[PDB]
Design a protein around this nucleic acid. Structure first.
Ligand SMILES: Nc1ncnc2c1ncn2[C@@H]1O[C@H](CSCC[C@H](N)C(=O)O)[C@@H](O)[C@H]1O
Ligand SMILES: [K+]
Ligand SMILES: [K+]
Ligand SMILES: [K+]
Ligand SMILES: [K+]
Ligand SMILES: [K+]
Ligand SMILES: [K+]
Ligand SMILES: [K+]
Ligand SMILES: [K+]
Ligand SMILES: [K+]
Ligand SMILES: [K+]
Ligand SMILES: [Mg+2]
Ligand SMILES: [Mg+2]
Ligand SMILES: [Mg+2]
Ligand SMILES: [Mg+2]
Ligand SMILES: [Mg+2]
Ligand SMILES: [Mg+2]
Ligand SMILES: [Mg+2]
Ligand SMILES: [Mg+2]
Ligand SMILES: [Mg+2]
Ligand SMILES: [Mg+2]
Ligand SMILES: [Mg+2]
Ligand SMILES: [Mg+2]
Ligand SMILES: [Mg+2]
Ligand SMILES: [Mg+2]
Ligand SMILES: [Mg+2]
Ligand SMILES: [Mg+2]
Ligand SMILES: [Mg+2]
Ligand SMILES: [Mg+2]
Ligand SMILES: [Mg+2]
Ligand SMILES: [Mg+2]
Ligand SMILES: [Mg+2]
Ligand SMILES: [Mg+2]
Ligand SMILES: [Mg+2]
Ligand SMILES: [Mg+2]
Ligand SMILES: [Mg+2]
Ligand SMILES: [Mg+2]
Ligand SMILES: [Mg+2]
Ligand SMILES: [Mg+2]
Ligand SMILES: [Mg+2]
Lengths: 307, 53
RNA sequence: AAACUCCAGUUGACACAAAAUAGACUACGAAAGUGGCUUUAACAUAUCUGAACACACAAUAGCUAAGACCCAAACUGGGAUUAGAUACCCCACUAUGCUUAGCCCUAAACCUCAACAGUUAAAUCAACAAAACUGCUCGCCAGAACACUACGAGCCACAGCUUAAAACUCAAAGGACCUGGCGGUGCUUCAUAUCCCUCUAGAGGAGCCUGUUCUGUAAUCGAUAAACCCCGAUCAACCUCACCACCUCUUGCUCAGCCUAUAUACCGCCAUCUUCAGCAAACCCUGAUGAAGGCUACAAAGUAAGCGCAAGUACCCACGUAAAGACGUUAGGUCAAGGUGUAGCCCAUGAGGUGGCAAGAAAUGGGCUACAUUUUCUACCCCAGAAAACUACGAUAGCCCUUAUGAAACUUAAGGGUCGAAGGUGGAUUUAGC
């Protein structure tokens, strides 16, 4: 089981109260969405996700609360249009909870292709076939040249040896198609000597697979999470009420950079800033909680109020 | 400044990310359309035959 | 009015903290240290040397106990920064820095110069530092690393200090200097179409033309940062042709042949700095005759043939533009101009014939034509008349026809008809011009 990351902080931070309407741009499993519908029984909430499986969960969970939760499906960019069809263009949303990253269910189910440890089709796509033409990670690795493929790993994955892990993929694809997660992991791990398979260690000084970050890179480029994160934050601001508390959760510093600067009005690469950081601190969950849920160790919560 | 006359007084987010996500997305889609060291001697030790000649 | 306020300014009171200026002085003490004022006590030795351990000392940090606490400040917390920042930056605060009494006994504790005595004549002297040496004595050293380590022993020290090896391993380790390279290296002057700004027209967006890349194909090759990319080609329908498939020939157009490998064996011809001014034979002198160095014009060791620059010549001048431009740099480009060293093929890696390849899912370089009113069309070659937004501007593109060349043309070029698209002057960035 996966406990919602920093659920206690996010609930206190948004202080859901009667007469307030809230939005959730990443319903996913719904642990955070349900923790918010428990504190305030009179709350009004809107949900959204890129995964139709995640949107079905919300629809099934809508039975628990008929109207307090409203389920929606679509990307961050398509969220404004989807919500504009409802007609809440001003929105006056008291808070927008923009949780980020991959869902626990998405990466716990091997079929979805997100887990390198297990054996599933190399999808790595949050989309659940809602757009059957959306390229999957397998297509990205088999099509892009070394120079192009390196860029994805170098930036999205923070891959220092971008040229090395990219050449191996180009050679492997020519011999046979790259269609499975374990196949990709072996291809990336072959770039380095056999010792290097688990030499790299996590931020907690815990050994991890050498290709762990490589999968993150392909995950971000298949789902264009970074570009969709900029539009999602911008759309939230337009639909966010004045004096309304926004709360994001940047699992990695990479996406945190966009959240870090957007709230501070700093150039992603003068007019007055329009945000109030009630909870400036960007801190991981309690160390006691990190061990229980290591997946969320790097969760950096950036809260702000619209000005 | 005092003498001067002031008159009557009153486009892709891909670049921000750092990679051209759109062009690459097209490139993969286009592919999908078709789918469906050596030793160096010390200079001082270089051998010569001038004396032997 | 009123009381409250961490807070700030003036004034006054105020310490168990630290001691501007003098101090540009170079004193005192065994060293460590010692720089506010006064006072008391007081700075061993009428040969010299003499200890890891004896005797007595010994910065800072640190320990034990009791006090002080202004300010500073490990740690710690908070705020930034960062891919990360348990750093550098900001704020707060503690051990600690102070006093007392005990410990601890370490420093790049370094003038990196042992004490004492003597000399300035010899050779002045590896180098650098700090001129070179003599006598005498104690301490110490004997390749690097292991190793301020292990064990033993001693110690108020107990994560400590002192003394201090071995095994395995290596052919070096190391000192001083010189050159080159490099410096998120200093200073000063700089670049003239020039590094930035400034000036003009452009590229980067659109279509097309063309090159390359990638992909594709049974189907060349070379160039490919500046210094590749309308480049070898002042040029590929056959031929050209070196490529692919098939068939054929074997002393073969040649006293054979090979566009087979190697441009990292070369000649040949060039790119590049060069939009440079230097290269250097032969001598001479300096440094002890070391690697190295060689200039002062009121001149102090340089002289130099030669090459380049320059001069001269070409074009319309003595201007300008061409041309020229050494040595060397990039084992730069070319074995596919030709030739050629080495290696390889010789019924085949050679020769001939027939047909065929050279496309675009795309990306990108250069260019062309445009987006119009300083324009569009016609007359004219500058005193005109019309056009001027979905019948405008705009294709040199697509489609259809004709013509030219040729044996061969959906294919190449020219012309006509049809068609009338993107494009509405183009982000970062970027080219050229005195
Ligand atoms: N651009 C995007 N638009 C919408 N949903 C997105 C998205 N990028 C990611 N998501 C989804 O947002 C979720 C983030 S991870 C899961 C968080 C969720 N609150 C939970 O219940 O755990 C995933 O379901 C993911 O598929
Ligand atoms: K003083
Ligand atoms: K002794
Ligand atoms: K010293
Ligand atoms: K030097
Ligand atoms: K342009
Ligand atoms: K040559
Ligand atoms: K040749
Ligand atoms: K040859
Ligand atoms: K042949
Ligand atoms: K162009
Ligand atoms: Mg004595
Ligand atoms: Mg002694
Ligand atoms: Mg000692
Ligand atoms: Mg002491
Ligand atoms: Mg003390
Ligand atoms: Mg204190
Ligand atoms: Mg203080
Ligand atoms: Mg000292
Ligand atoms: Mg002595
Ligand atoms: Mg030794
Ligand atoms: Mg020591
Ligand atoms: Mg010891
Ligand atoms: Mg011992
Ligand atoms: Mg263009
Ligand atoms: Mg080619
Ligand atoms: Mg080549
Ligand atoms: Mg070559
Ligand atoms: Mg080159
Ligand atoms: Mg031909
Ligand atoms: Mg041949
Ligand atoms: Mg060469
Ligand atoms: Mg002249
Ligand atoms: Mg010239
Ligand atoms: Mg000349
Ligand atoms: Mg070469
Ligand atoms: Mg032929
Ligand atoms: Mg036409
Ligand atoms: Mg004819
Ligand atoms: Mg027209």
């Amino acid at each position: 089981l996966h406990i919602p990351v920093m659920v206690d902080e996010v609930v206190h931070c948004l202080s859901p109260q009667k007469g307030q309407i809230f939005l959730d741009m990443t319903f996913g499993s719904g642990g955070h969405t349900k923790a918010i519908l428990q504190k305030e029984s009179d709350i009004v909430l809107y949900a959204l996700d890129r995964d139709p499986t995640a949107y079905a969960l919300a629809e099934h969970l809508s039975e628990l609360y008929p109207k307090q939760i409203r389920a929606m499906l679509g990307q961050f960019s398509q969220a404004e249009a989807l919500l504009m069809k409802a007609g809440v263009q001003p929105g006056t949303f008291d808070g927008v909870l923009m949780d980020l990253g991959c869902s626990s269910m998405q990466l716990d189910t091997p079929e979805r292709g997100f887990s390198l440890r297990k054996d599933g089709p190399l999808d790595m796509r949050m989309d659940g076939g809602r757009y059957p033409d959306m390229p999957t990670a397998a297509d990205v690795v088999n099509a892009l040249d070394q120079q192009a493929l390196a860029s994805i790993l170098r930036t999205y994955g923070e891959e220092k040896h971008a040229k090395k892990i990219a050449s191996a993929i180009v050679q492997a694809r020519s011999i046979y198609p790259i269609t499975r997660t374990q196949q990709l992991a072996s291809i990336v791990a072959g770039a380095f000597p056999p010792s290097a398979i688990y030499t790299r260690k996590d931020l907690l000084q815990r050994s991890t697979h050498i290709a762990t970050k490589t999968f993150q890179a392909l995950r971000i480029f298949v789902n264009n999470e970074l570009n969709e994160l900029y539009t999602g934050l911008k759309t939230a601001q337009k639909f966010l009420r004045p004096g309304g508390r926004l709360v994001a959760l940047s699992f990695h510093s990479l996406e945190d950079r966009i959240v870090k600067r957007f709230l501070l009005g700093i150039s992603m690469t003068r007019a007055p800033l329009m945000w109030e950081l009630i909870h400036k601190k960007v801190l991981s969950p309690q160390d006691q909680d990190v061990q229980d849920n290591p997946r969320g160790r790097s969760a950096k919560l950036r809260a702000a109020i619209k000005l | 400044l005092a003498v001067a006359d002031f008159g009557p007084r009153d486009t892709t987010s891909s670049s921000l990310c750092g990679i051209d996500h759109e062009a690459l997305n097209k490139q993969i889609m286009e592919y999908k359309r078709r789918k469906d060291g050596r030793k160096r001697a010390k200079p001082r030790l270089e051998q010569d035959s001038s004396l032997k000649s």
